[PDB]
DNA sequence: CATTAAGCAGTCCGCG
DNA sequence: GCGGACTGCTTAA
């Protein structure tokens, strides 16, 4: 097999590399790497090395990495560019692996771990590590085993061995319900003292050294706790055995009233699953406890136990260990679904970077571009200092706030990457400039054609049409990958709906799910077999379809994120290829494209409808247009349609057969106008929206820019079994909105869009009547808590103190002196509740860590003093008032002359 | 070592 | 009791 790296580090003049050899064996080597850098040289000097602008360079081979670094400094002092890859480990990987890396994940040791630490005096701080580590569960991906290290004797209590037999039993039978499928994979190791536990764990670690180290919150808790605990007991050099190169770096962060740290373990790639989830999941959660996320991702219930965690080991050691194990497993379950470790490996090896560098789009792209240029013997430019400078982005149309009955939307494929490719935007493809006209002059096709020779953006930039650019070349590769995966995702989505339709008529039989690949649209023969399946088999197939969709989503959305990341990197001062000419060439072109096509669509629809000057495009944001289809439906007459699906089919056909060709013609004209390299402005129909035929539903509404709701029947070619609400920007979509309020507002919208005003009024009446009965957590608002210290004046709110920070301060005073109340952590999220006048907390609100029950001591007082009136008005009524006024509806029956009668 | 546009909640201040 | 300037937070893209 071809060799591939596992980890790489620079330590002084040495590169330390862990890798898999040609026999599939894990190896380590230390290399005194001899890096090269480059300097511009005279034309008369024959060379094979050229910078990206074709200027000749001479190669400077250094005896060591420090010499190369020192030379960079001297060149800066002289005032001359020092070219080439200055991150030497990237150059080393590029030199060592001068081919496309084919890696074998089965050879890569992925470790998932979590530790338990009993602490009778508040949160056990990793930087202090003053309490015994009393449990470790460490899952090894190569062994496929959960290694459980259990401390039986501690200053905080002596306990009996954990029982695997009780652990397997149902919770309803006194057990812990450790999943049956991992019972046989547990290797249990009890210890009589902590020193022996930790010594054995370190020995184990040497035998099975993680390459990828993950788990929930490992970077901020488990890793620094284990490191510091071992340091305190055995000394720092023993602790450094956690690094296969025995080198660590301690990063101390000061927070005025916190002081925590992160430990870099050289030779290990730490990918904290919380960080992976935050980067790759495209959610924004009100809480990041493993309980909350596991519930969200897997629909599994919270791991329940009685009493505080500080007392769980002593009272119920059995459950304590079981919950440690299950916690480790739940991360594995989330990854089985989301596949973020797979993604990280794919991306890391594609770029030839340290795997943990997938968190940095700048590092990732720098490496991809360096490798691409190196293949052509080209030399990359030196990174330079740039002052931060704001620049213009996308265009967003101001919508007329209103209900909108029939809507069809259209969207440009992968806009910013497509602009890059169409225009040919790259650092080395810049051909010059032209004199800009006002943007509206381009939009309206009245400005002089910018160039008949070069490819242009309305920001004034010109690019070569007959040269390949490294940015377009490499962005195209990732786009094409993205496209493949999105295809699989959409196919799985369509397949899911086929199964959902068949679930309306399940067969009474004993059968099995069909062996199919959900990444491809089901054949007619598969569809025939599906219509004969049992509910059990259909539901299993739907689970598999949805899981395929999720896998596809992870793969496509994050490749989309990477390529969009390149467009944005051009506007980040730390990017080697920072250039606002290129960054704004993209965004300005996008503004033109959107407004150009708005014009073209208005012109076209007026033409086919026999009218003039009517506004069909009601809204647009960045690369999308929303077209009012009322006149289209009216042109034929609503009476002509047999059911909802009939008009949906009609509009689908209309968009594909009539509008899309007109849109394509419009964009081809724009491409000729800008004299672009390749036409890539592909705008396809996205949503078809409207009320159910015959209903009093309003179909859709806009309240303003980035704020709308649509009742959707078909999305990007997926014909839904049941209409789906597309709500953007409204409070239902915000993690700050109380959970039950999101729910109630969504039903309010559903009723508006599908059923009408009277249905809405009936629901509002009910929710207002029952509001006071909802669980307090379900009606609490949520906020991130930043700069708490800034507004903290002796436990009281300083000037301009934000509402949620005021709540936190109220909480801190309420829990003062109590050494077992959960402290609010800077930067993390809190639940927030308003408090009635004259409450014992002495302020208008309280806040506490999100995803948690408020501590028992003050829970009673919170519940008693909760301001339900304020809460309802602010979180529910006020947003709903916004939706209904825009939609020209009332959520409450208004008074009228009819009130004089008895109905 | 490392994208912009834009809406809403809230504080402060002004307001016989 | 609101509106304008301003900060903070969180979306859409
Ligand atoms: N998360 C983001 N970060 C940076 N730029 C973004 C982001 N989302 C969107 N943009 C910019 C770049 C996109 O090309 C443009 C249009 O957004 P959008 O339509 O969501 O995706 P897209 O056009 O890139 O892909 P798709 O093919 O899925 O439509 O807005
Ligand atoms: Ca725990
Ligand atoms: Ca798009
Ligand atoms: Ca059937
Ligand atoms: Ca879009
Ligand atoms: Ca599309």
mmCIF file with all atom_site columns, N, CA, C and O in Angstrom, chain A residues 786-806:
data_model
loop_
_atom_site.group_PDB
_atom_site.id
_atom_site.type_symbol
_atom_site.label_atom_id
_atom_site.label_alt_id
_atom_site.label_comp_id
_atom_site.label_asym_id
_atom_site.label_entity_id
_atom_site.label_seq_id
_atom_site.pdbx_PDB_ins_code
_atom_site.Cartn_x
_atom_site.Cartn_y
_atom_site.Cartn_z
_atom_site.occupancy
_atom_site.B_iso_or_equiv
_atom_site.pdbx_formal_charge
_atom_site.auth_seq_id
_atom_site.auth_comp_id
_atom_site.auth_asym_id
_atom_site.auth_atom_id
_atom_site.pdbx_PDB_model_num
ATOM 1  N N  . UNK A 1 786 ? -21.068 36.913 27.014 1.00 0.00 ? 786 UNK A N  1
ATOM 2  C CA . UNK A 1 786 ? -19.729 37.435 26.776 1.00 0.00 ? 786 UNK A CA 1
ATOM 3  C C  . UNK A 1 786 ? -19.437 38.661 27.639 1.00 0.00 ? 786 UNK A C  1
ATOM 4  O O  . UNK A 1 786 ? -20.347 39.418 27.984 1.00 0.00 ? 786 UNK A O  1
ATOM 5  N N  . UNK A 1 787 ? -18.163 38.834 27.990 1.00 0.00 ? 787 UNK A N  1
ATOM 6  C CA . UNK A 1 787 ? -17.683 39.972 28.795 1.00 0.00 ? 787 UNK A CA 1
ATOM 7  C C  . UNK A 1 787 ? -18.464 40.220 30.089 1.00 0.00 ? 787 UNK A C  1
ATOM 8  O O  . UNK A 1 787 ? -18.841 41.359 30.389 1.00 0.00 ? 787 UNK A O  1
ATOM 9  N N  . UNK A 1 788 ? -18.692 39.148 30.848 1.00 0.00 ? 788 UNK A N  1
ATOM 10 C CA . UNK A 1 788 ? -19.414 39.223 32.125 1.00 0.00 ? 788 UNK A CA 1
ATOM 11 C C  . UNK A 1 788 ? -18.705 40.161 33.106 1.00 0.00 ? 788 UNK A C  1
ATOM 12 O O  . UNK A 1 788 ? -19.346 41.007 33.744 1.00 0.00 ? 788 UNK A O  1
ATOM 13 N N  . UNK A 1 789 ? -17.382 40.005 33.201 1.00 0.00 ? 789 UNK A N  1
ATOM 14 C CA . UNK A 1 789 ? -16.537 40.793 34.100 1.00 0.00 ? 789 UNK A CA 1
ATOM 15 C C  . UNK A 1 789 ? -16.667 42.297 33.872 1.00 0.00 ? 789 UNK A C  1
ATOM 16 O O  . UNK A 1 789 ? -16.725 43.067 34.833 1.00 0.00 ? 789 UNK A O  1
ATOM 17 N N  . UNK A 1 790 ? -16.730 42.702 32.603 1.00 0.00 ? 790 UNK A N  1
ATOM 18 C CA . UNK A 1 790 ? -16.809 44.118 32.226 1.00 0.00 ? 790 UNK A CA 1
ATOM 19 C C  . UNK A 1 790 ? -17.928 44.878 32.939 1.00 0.00 ? 790 UNK A C  1
ATOM 20 O O  . UNK A 1 790 ? -17.747 46.029 33.334 1.00 0.00 ? 790 UNK A O  1
ATOM 21 N N  . UNK A 1 791 ? -19.078 44.230 33.095 1.00 0.00 ? 791 UNK A N  1
ATOM 22 C CA . UNK A 1 791 ? -20.260 44.879 33.649 1.00 0.00 ? 791 UNK A CA 1
ATOM 23 C C  . UNK A 1 791 ? -20.490 44.525 35.124 1.00 0.00 ? 791 UNK A C  1
ATOM 24 O O  . UNK A 1 791 ? -21.534 44.852 35.696 1.00 0.00 ? 791 UNK A O  1
ATOM 25 N N  . UNK A 1 792 ? -19.500 43.875 35.733 1.00 0.00 ? 792 UNK A N  1
ATOM 26 C CA . UNK A 1 792 ? -19.590 43.415 37.116 1.00 0.00 ? 792 UNK A CA 1
ATOM 27 C C  . UNK A 1 792 ? -18.972 44.427 38.089 1.00 0.00 ? 792 UNK A C  1
ATOM 28 O O  . UNK A 1 792 ? -17.751 44.479 38.250 1.00 0.00 ? 792 UNK A O  1
ATOM 29 N N  . UNK A 1 793 ? -19.823 45.223 38.734 1.00 0.00 ? 793 UNK A N  1
ATOM 30 C CA . UNK A 1 793 ? -19.367 46.214 39.719 1.00 0.00 ? 793 UNK A CA 1
ATOM 31 C C  . UNK A 1 793 ? -19.806 45.815 41.135 1.00 0.00 ? 793 UNK A C  1
ATOM 32 O O  . UNK A 1 793 ? -20.890 46.191 41.597 1.00 0.00 ? 793 UNK A O  1
ATOM 33 N N  . UNK A 1 794 ? -18.953 45.045 41.806 1.00 0.00 ? 794 UNK A N  1
ATOM 34 C CA . UNK A 1 794 ? -19.235 44.537 43.149 1.00 0.00 ? 794 UNK A CA 1
ATOM 35 C C  . UNK A 1 794 ? -20.450 43.629 43.213 1.00 0.00 ? 794 UNK A C  1
ATOM 36 O O  . UNK A 1 794 ? -21.234 43.699 44.164 1.00 0.00 ? 794 UNK A O  1
ATOM 37 N N  . UNK A 1 795 ? -20.607 42.782 42.196 1.00 0.00 ? 795 UNK A N  1
ATOM 38 C CA . UNK A 1 795 ? -21.748 41.871 42.099 1.00 0.00 ? 795 UNK A CA 1
ATOM 39 C C  . UNK A 1 795 ? -23.005 42.498 41.517 1.00 0.00 ? 795 UNK A C  1
ATOM 40 O O  . UNK A 1 795 ? -24.039 41.838 41.415 1.00 0.00 ? 795 UNK A O  1
ATOM 41 N N  . UNK A 1 796 ? -22.915 43.770 41.134 1.00 0.00 ? 796 UNK A N  1
ATOM 42 C CA . UNK A 1 796 ? -24.058 44.521 40.617 1.00 0.00 ? 796 UNK A CA 1
ATOM 43 C C  . UNK A 1 796 ? -23.788 45.059 39.210 1.00 0.00 ? 796 UNK A C  1
ATOM 44 O O  . UNK A 1 796 ? -22.627 45.233 38.831 1.00 0.00 ? 796 UNK A O  1
ATOM 45 N N  . UNK A 1 797 ? -24.858 45.317 38.429 1.00 0.00 ? 797 UNK A N  1
ATOM 46 C CA . UNK A 1 797 ? -24.718 45.739 37.030 1.00 0.00 ? 797 UNK A CA 1
ATOM 47 C C  . UNK A 1 797 ? -24.105 47.129 36.856 1.00 0.00 ? 797 UNK A C  1
ATOM 48 O O  . UNK A 1 797 ? -24.621 48.111 37.395 1.00 0.00 ? 797 UNK A O  1
ATOM 49 N N  . UNK A 1 798 ? -23.007 47.192 36.106 1.00 0.00 ? 798 UNK A N  1
ATOM 50 C CA . UNK A 1 798 ? -22.395 48.456 35.708 1.00 0.00 ? 798 UNK A CA 1
ATOM 51 C C  . UNK A 1 798 ? -23.176 49.119 34.584 1.00 0.00 ? 798 UNK A C  1
ATOM 52 O O  . UNK A 1 798 ? -24.170 48.562 34.113 1.00 0.00 ? 798 UNK A O  1
ATOM 53 N N  . UNK A 1 799 ? -22.736 50.313 34.143 1.00 0.00 ? 799 UNK A N  1
ATOM 54 C CA . UNK A 1 799 ? -23.448 51.059 33.096 1.00 0.00 ? 799 UNK A CA 1
ATOM 55 C C  . UNK A 1 799 ? -23.534 50.303 31.764 1.00 0.00 ? 799 UNK A C  1
ATOM 56 O O  . UNK A 1 799 ? -22.557 49.682 31.342 1.00 0.00 ? 799 UNK A O  1
ATOM 57 N N  . UNK A 1 800 ? -24.707 50.357 31.131 1.00 0.00 ? 800 UNK A N  1
ATOM 58 C CA . UNK A 1 800 ? -24.980 49.693 29.846 1.00 0.00 ? 800 UNK A CA 1
ATOM 59 C C  . UNK A 1 800 ? -24.952 48.161 29.927 1.00 0.00 ? 800 UNK A C  1
ATOM 60 O O  . UNK A 1 800 ? -24.776 47.483 28.909 1.00 0.00 ? 800 UNK A O  1
ATOM 61 N N  . UNK A 1 801 ? -25.137 47.622 31.131 1.00 0.00 ? 801 UNK A N  1
ATOM 62 C CA . UNK A 1 801 ? -25.146 46.174 31.338 1.00 0.00 ? 801 UNK A CA 1
ATOM 63 C C  . UNK A 1 801 ? -26.274 45.503 30.551 1.00 0.00 ? 801 UNK A C  1
ATOM 64 O O  . UNK A 1 801 ? -27.445 45.836 30.743 1.00 0.00 ? 801 UNK A O  1
ATOM 65 N N  . UNK A 1 802 ? -25.923 44.556 29.657 1.00 0.00 ? 802 UNK A N  1
ATOM 66 C CA . UNK A 1 802 ? -26.948 43.828 28.904 1.00 0.00 ? 802 UNK A CA 1
ATOM 67 C C  . UNK A 1 802 ? -27.872 43.031 29.828 1.00 0.00 ? 802 UNK A C  1
ATOM 68 O O  . UNK A 1 802 ? -27.461 42.623 30.921 1.00 0.00 ? 802 UNK A O  1
ATOM 69 N N  . UNK A 1 803 ? -29.108 42.827 29.382 1.00 0.00 ? 803 UNK A N  1
ATOM 70 C CA . UNK A 1 803 ? -30.138 42.130 30.155 1.00 0.00 ? 803 UNK A CA 1
ATOM 71 C C  . UNK A 1 803 ? -29.704 40.751 30.662 1.00 0.00 ? 803 UNK A C  1
ATOM 72 O O  . UNK A 1 803 ? -29.931 40.413 31.825 1.00 0.00 ? 803 UNK A O  1
ATOM 73 N N  . UNK A 1 804 ? -29.086 39.958 29.787 1.00 0.00 ? 804 UNK A N  1
ATOM 74 C CA . UNK A 1 804 ? -28.676 38.600 30.153 1.00 0.00 ? 804 UNK A CA 1
ATOM 75 C C  . UNK A 1 804 ? -27.530 38.587 31.136 1.00 0.00 ? 804 UNK A C  1
ATOM 76 O O  . UNK A 1 804 ? -27.481 37.734 32.017 1.00 0.00 ? 804 UNK A O  1
ATOM 77 N N  . UNK A 1 805 ? -26.621 39.552 31.006 1.00 0.00 ? 805 UNK A N  1
ATOM 78 C CA . UNK A 1 805 ? -25.512 39.731 31.953 1.00 0.00 ? 805 UNK A CA 1
ATOM 79 C C  . UNK A 1 805 ? -26.031 40.169 33.329 1.00 0.00 ? 805 UNK A C  1
ATOM 80 O O  . UNK A 1 805 ? -25.542 39.698 34.359 1.00 0.00 ? 805 UNK A O  1
ATOM 81 N N  . UNK A 1 806 ? -27.026 41.056 33.343 1.00 0.00 ? 806 UNK A N  1
ATOM 82 C CA . UNK A 1 806 ? -27.721 41.421 34.578 1.00 0.00 ? 806 UNK A CA 1
ATOM 83 C C  . UNK A 1 806 ? -28.283 40.176 35.278 1.00 0.00 ? 806 UNK A C  1
ATOM 84 O O  . UNK A 1 806 ? -28.186 40.048 36.501 1.00 0.00 ? 806 UNK A O  1
#
